Design a protein around this ligand. Structure first.
Ligand SMILES: CC(C)[C@@H]1N(Cc2ccc(C(=O)NC[C@]3(O)CCCN(c4ncnc5[nH]ccc45)C3)c(O)c2)CC12CCC2
Lengths: 232, 195
């Protein structure tokens, strides 16, 4: 059965037709999860160095212009000082969309000094509702690239495409990130009120409330918790 | 000449100029991760094959970046990336993660025109037939985009022979050429007939 041909006919995307114990690691993640902390910041005009200590995971989710049919160009993004706040061995997940970010985002990663190890691809289904000039196909997926520095989950996330102008990323990304057990200092740049979450330090230009306190924060990782994988 | 044609050879030594110009180029190359070394990859004579047109380049692991290099080096801009979602006979999903997909870069050269941009969508779902195989569905997608036109595949295996397609592998069964202009430039470039 050919689904590329079917979509030509009906408008249902090939992905509209995919189908379908380890519950304890979720619980251990929860125990080791710090309080949620969330700091409002107009990140353009914000010195990243103020964000401390140095992070074990950085989830970066910049408002791409392409999300709307204040935006951040890749020109804008590629000039963040992400290396300054990463940790010697640490990770990064960068939402690139499907356009130039597929390429400019790899540049970024190399710039801040990461090398890619994973290409996690969000697949958007149009079950409940069957274009760049520079495009060739209907784009129906986004890429969240995963990079490392120093030193059971799959690389697919399938959900129904969100209502137009909804921009939130599928939360499963968090479950993929957290099931890796890469430490506890976690940072979600350009988060929003809506994404605040235990175990994470959200930082963004629309957060309507703030509780972040560099010192208060560091204390959660004061010895004897420095190198917790956060799954224990 | 509409039917398949193929050339068992070494794509590193064949005077690919004799093959002319193609609307679509596709390559499923054996990346060092048969093998070609990265320079051989860089050194391939892709730029002769197209004046205007599209290139489809399969990648895995770290070819994801090198392939973006070779793509750019040969003179294409990557415009789309295609994903293949690998399923079983009942439509379920067969380093740091387990991999449910393979990747295919799409590049563009010149000012190609007449194409049906937008006909299909950048995700593919089809059964994992055999190993190392790519799904016949890509020939669907590529036909609808530039129907009727000259297409050339590189590092094809004897199954990848297709109508309108000149396959180039080193497991192909000899040489089968029917297009005159090519059959021409071949005997002129190749008199005894070995590469
Ligand atoms: C996502 C893609 C990267 C991935 N690919 C990986 C792959 C697997 C098998 C073959 C293959 O065996 N191809 C036939 C062959 O003939 C055999 C020998 C080498 N090769 C040559 N042909 C002409 N001259 C040559 N000189 C040196 C080599 C040579 C071609 C291949 O090419 C690529 C497959 C995918 C598709 C999804 C996964």
């Amino acid at each position: 059965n050919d689904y590329c041909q079917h979509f030509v006919d009906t408008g249902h995307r090939p992905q509209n037709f995919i189908r379908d114990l380890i519950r304890l690691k979720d619980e251990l993640i929860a125990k080791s999860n710090t309080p949620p902390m969330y700091l409002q910041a107009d990140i353009e005009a914000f010195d990243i160095r103020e964000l401390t200590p140095k992070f074990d995971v950085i989830l970066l989710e910049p408002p791409l212009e392409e999300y709307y049919r204040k935006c951040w160009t890749w020109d804008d993004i590629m000039k963040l000082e992400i290396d300054e706040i990463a940790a010697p061995r640490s990770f990064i997940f960068l939402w690139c969309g499907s356009g130039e970010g597929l390429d400019l985002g790899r540049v970024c990663l190399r710039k801040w000094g990461y090398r890619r190890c994973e290409d996690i691809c969000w697949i958007k289904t149009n079950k409940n509702n069957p274009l760049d000039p520079k495009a060739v196909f209907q784009r129906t997926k986004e890429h969240c690239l995963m990079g490392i520095k120093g030193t059971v989950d799959i690389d697919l996330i399938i959900t129904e495409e969100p209502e137009i102008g909804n921009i939130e990323k599928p939360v499963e990304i968090f479950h993929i990130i957290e099931h890796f057990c890469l430490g506890r200092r976690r940072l979600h740049l350009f988060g929003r009120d809506s994404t605040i979450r235990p175990g994470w330090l959200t930082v963004g230009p629309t957060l309507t409330n703030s509780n972040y306190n560099a010192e208060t924060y560091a204390s959660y990782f004061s010895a004897p918790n420095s190198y917790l994988t956060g799954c224990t | 000449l509409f039917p398949p044609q193929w050339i068992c050879c070494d794509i590193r030594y064949l005077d690919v100029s004799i093959l002319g110009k193609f609307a679509v180029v596709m390559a499923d190359p054996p990346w060092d991760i048969g093998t070609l070394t990265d320079d051989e990859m860089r050194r391939l004579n892709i730029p002769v094959l197209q004046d205007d047109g599209f290139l489809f380049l399969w990648v895995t692991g770290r070819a994801m970046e090198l392939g973006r290099e070779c793509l750019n080096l040969w003179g294409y801009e990557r415009v789309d990336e295609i994903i293949w979602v690998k399923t079983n006979q009942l439509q379920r999903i067969i380093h740091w993660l387990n991999h449910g997909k393979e990747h295919c870069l799409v590049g563009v050269k010149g000012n190609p025109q007449g194409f049906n941009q937008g006909l299909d969508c950048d995700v593919i779902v089809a059964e994992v037939r055999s190993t190392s195989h790519k799904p016949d569905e890509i020939y669907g997608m590529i036909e609808r985009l530039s129907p009727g036109t000259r297409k050339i595949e590189l590092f094809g295996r004897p199954h990848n022979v297709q109508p309108n397609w000149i396959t180039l592998g080193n497991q192909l069964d000899g040489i089968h050429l029917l297009d005159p202009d090519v059959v021409a430039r071949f005997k002129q470039r190749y008199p005894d007939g070995i590469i």
